[PDB]
Amino acid sequence: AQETDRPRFSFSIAAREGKARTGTIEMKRGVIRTPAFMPVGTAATVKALKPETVRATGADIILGNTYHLMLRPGAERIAKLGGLHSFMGWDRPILTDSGGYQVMSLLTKQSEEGVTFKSHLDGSRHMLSPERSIEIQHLLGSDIVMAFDESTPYPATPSRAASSMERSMRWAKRSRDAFDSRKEQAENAALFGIQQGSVFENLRQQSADALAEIGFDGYAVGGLAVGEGQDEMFRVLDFSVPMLPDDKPHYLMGVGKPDDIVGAVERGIDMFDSVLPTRSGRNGQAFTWDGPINIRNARFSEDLKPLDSECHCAVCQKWSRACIHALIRAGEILGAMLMTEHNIAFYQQLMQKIRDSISEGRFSQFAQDFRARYFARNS
């Protein structure tokens, strides 16, 4: 297996239960077990977890934010340093987003051509387009490349949703052709397209048909987790995911809380990313099977139990709630490091329980058991 050839991108489904699937994506830099959670990476420095720590939590792939990497230190500099894998100290697969969401979310010109913007960090002028985004993701050397699309706001008028979806599909074809124009990228990386259409079923169908006609290695459901509430996100997923090709991975970008993930897998999603484990860890919040906890709470000052008494992570094998409480209350960076490591490992253990329960044909029961306990909050 270590001495055997590695494919560019091969998705295999090993077991199904309803709309949920479990399987593997094989790529040249490693195997991704699905459903998969991708932690959001940053530069390999003393301020973040070590890459070996992130791998030991169970992560098979991480996400890079193209927009931030463009602004500092820049894509040309990362390429000169050997690419994102060398820059981040991570030798397994990396998915990069297109950079387009943070352009809107965080602007000199805007048209069907693409966008121009100035950096808040130094005032430098930057440009993004389907062609430029794919080029930058090539310079970063990422393994999964996201097509460049146009985000529709929330809430969105049906006219604005139609306009952004249609532009996104023209940009999806441009993304496809730019990716295919570069032999080194097309033979070694994969390209995902992004379905849009807001909450409107007919627009989602139009979008799915357009992406399937272009053809991609995987398909993301875009335009969700932007403030719509879980009920609505689930309702959109109910009809949107069946529209995508069944035999390719389905990616829900930027989701999310543990119960978001469970419900999305019930609806056919294979891949997830979120900053939540890290943001929560830095803020003194831990995920547990009994719901999130705020470790600063007085009730934890003498609690000798680990953050979660069923969590297998390296933190919970050693550190008590009481001592992580002490570290966080003192502002010691070790406290935030430990809670971040635990939160990412908890997410990976959630994904593993999901994969195991699908394989054993008991995922619907797992999801019900999970919700009953997570929302009772007997922590």
The catalytic residues are 97, 273
Candidates 97-105, 210-218, 322-330, 366-374 — which segment interacts with a second copy by CB under 8 A? 322-330
**Positions of E strands within the chain:** 9-17, 20-27, 30-34, 36-39, 62-64, 94-96, 109-111, 114-118, 125-128, 144-146, 190-195, 218-221, 250-252, 271-274, 285-286, 293-294
Q: Cα–Cα distances in Å, from 324 out to 135, 291, 327, 340?
A: 43, 18, 5, 11
316 binds, among a second copy, Zn ion, none (CB under 5 to 8 A by kind): Zn ion
284 is in an annotated binding site: no
316 is in an annotated binding site: yes
Say which residue the tokens 């829900």 belong to: 252
Binding of residue 46 to a second copy (CB under 8 A): no
Which residue in 109, 318, 362, 377 binds a second copy (CB under 8 A)? 318
Residue 181 structure tokens: 């124009």
Q: Which is nearer to a second copy, 131 or 341 (CB)?
A: 341
Binding of residue 330 to a second copy (CB under 8 A): yes
Binding of residue 42 to a second copy (CB under 8 A): no
319 binds, among Zn ion, a second copy, none (CB under 5 to 8 A by kind): a second copy
175 is in an annotated binding site: no
Residue 36 structure tokens: 């998969």
Q: What is the dihedral of CA 72, 274, 12, 86, to 10 degrees?
A: 30
Candidates 74-82, 119-127, 290-298, 323-331 — which segment interacts with a second copy by CB under 8 A? 323-331
Residue 68 structure tokens: 């931030």
Binding of residue 56 to a second copy (CB under 8 A): no
Candidates 68-76, 218-226, 266-274, 327-335 — which segment interacts with a second copy by CB under 8 A? 327-335
Residue 350 structure tokens: 């959630």
Q: What is the CA radius of gyration of the chain?
A: 21
Alpha-carbon gap, residue 101 to 104, rounded angstroms: 5
**Of 150, 147, 127, nearest to 137 (Cα)?**
147
The site for Zn ion (CB under 5 A) is made up of 311, 313, 315-316, 342
Candidates 132-140, 156-164, 284-292, 318-326 — which segment interacts with a second copy by CB under 8 A? 318-326
Binding of residue 213 to a second copy (CB under 8 A): no
74 is in an annotated binding site: no
Alpha-carbon gap, residue 194 to 172, rounded angstroms: 8
Contact positions vs a second copy (CB under 8 A)? 302, 304, 318-320, 322-323, 326-327, 330, 332, 334
Query: Residues marked as binding for substrate?
Result: 97-101, 149, 196, 223
Query: Residues marked as binding for Zn(2+)?
Result: 311, 313, 316, 342
